[PDB]
Chain A
Amino acid sequence: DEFEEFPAEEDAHVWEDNWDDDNVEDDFSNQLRAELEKHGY
């Protein structure tokens, strides 16, 4: 019972990727270094 009325119109990774993976940000080491030097002084 196919629905032919509606026409049926690289990154080949197997693991499930969560939305946060797409979010861009600096490395955690950089963030930790920045926070450490901010709170150090």
Chain B
Amino acid sequence: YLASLIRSVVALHNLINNKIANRDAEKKEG
């Protein structure tokens, strides 16, 4: 359970980073 929680938190952080990156690219395009 601890390892699964670690992995889920890591995946959530990665998804947040990816959303931030794609929004940064979209806003920097203009």
A–B contact, 8 Å CB criterion (strictly below): no
